[PDB]
Amino acid sequence: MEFFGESWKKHLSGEFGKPYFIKLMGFVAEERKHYTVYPPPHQVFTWTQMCDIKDVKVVILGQNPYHGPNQAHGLCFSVQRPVPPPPSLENIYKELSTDIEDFVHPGHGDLSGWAKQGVLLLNAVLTVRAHQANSHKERGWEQFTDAVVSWLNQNSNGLVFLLWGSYAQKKGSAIDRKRHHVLQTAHPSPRSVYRGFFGCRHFSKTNELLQKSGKKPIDWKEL
DNA sequence: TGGGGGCTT
DNA sequence: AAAGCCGCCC
Numbered sequence: 001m002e003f004f005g006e007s008w009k010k011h012l013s014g015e016f017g018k019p020y021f022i023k024l025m026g027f028v029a030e031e032r033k034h035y036t037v038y039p040p041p042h043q044v045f046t047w048t049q050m051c052d053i054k055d056v057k058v059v060i061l062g063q064n065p066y067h068g069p070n071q072a073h074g075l076c077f078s079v080q081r082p083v084p085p086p087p088s089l090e091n092i093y094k095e096l097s098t099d100i101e102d103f104v105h106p107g108h109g110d111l112s113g114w115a116k117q118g119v120l121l122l123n124a125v126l127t128v129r130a131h132q133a134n135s136h137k138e139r140g141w142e143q144f145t146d147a148v149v150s151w152l153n154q155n156s157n158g159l160v161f162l163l164w165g166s167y168a169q170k171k172g173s174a175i176d177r178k179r180h181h182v183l184q185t186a187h188p189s190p191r192s193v194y195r196g197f198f199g200c201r202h203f204s205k206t207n208e209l210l211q212k213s214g215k216k217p218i219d220w221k222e223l
Numbered sequence: 224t225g226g227g228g229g230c231t232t
Numbered sequence: 233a234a235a236g237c238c239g240c241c242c
């Protein structure tokens with residue numbers, strides 16, 4: 001059907017008519033008529049197409065999409081075949097390997113598996129100019145993504161959130177630490193993986209917390 | 224073989 | 233806000 005999944009549109013609809021958003025889309029479109037922008041128009045909101053807002057249990061949040069051609073497709077750190085898993089997804093794979101013994105490198109970079117399971121693969125800023133990192137930062141995405149988190153926070157229980165990287169962690173000060181389990185760590189990029197990511201064991205810690213709260217855990221190899 | 228965050232000034 | 237300094241696997 002369309003760009004936004006039913007539940008998501010329904011619950012984020014209140015944002016559409018807000019000036020910050022109007023102008024924002026205005027900005028992005030302009031951008032497009034003058035520069036290559038990722039992810040392409042139809043893919044900016046893939047994260048809403050993967051599962052109903054009502055049954056999202058975990059929220060992995062990154063900063064901006066891959067400013068490289070063929071990478072950014074709507075789900076954070078994910079690349080659709082026949083594109084290979086970029087550094088960030090390789091580092092994520094290294095951890096998963098050690099963290100979850102049942103897990104083995106799946107041979108591709110599509111994260112739709114987790115997504116369909118109830119993992120919101122969000123990103124703070126949803127679009128980026130070709131070959132130019134941080135270009136669409138502070139244009140309105142943050143407030144929109146703030147809106148996403150905000151809602152999820154107010155209307156859910158036991159959401160396990162994974163805030164990877166400083167910019168991502170900024171959102172943490174809007175999550176009720178009592179009802180929701182929050183885990184932080186360095187962004188998986190080569191440039192920042194050694195500062196904590198490697199060894200965090202978020203994935204396992206996640207199934208733990210989720211099982212504890214009486215909810216089916218995640219099958220991290222099912223992707 | 225160099226392009227892929229985190230913190231300071 | 234912009235720019236510099238630093239950091240690092242197979």
Ligand SMILES: O=c1cc[nH]c(=O)[nH]1
Nearest residue numbers: 062063064065076077
């Ligand atoms: O989608 C992606 C890729 C890299 N870094 C992020 O924060 N998100």
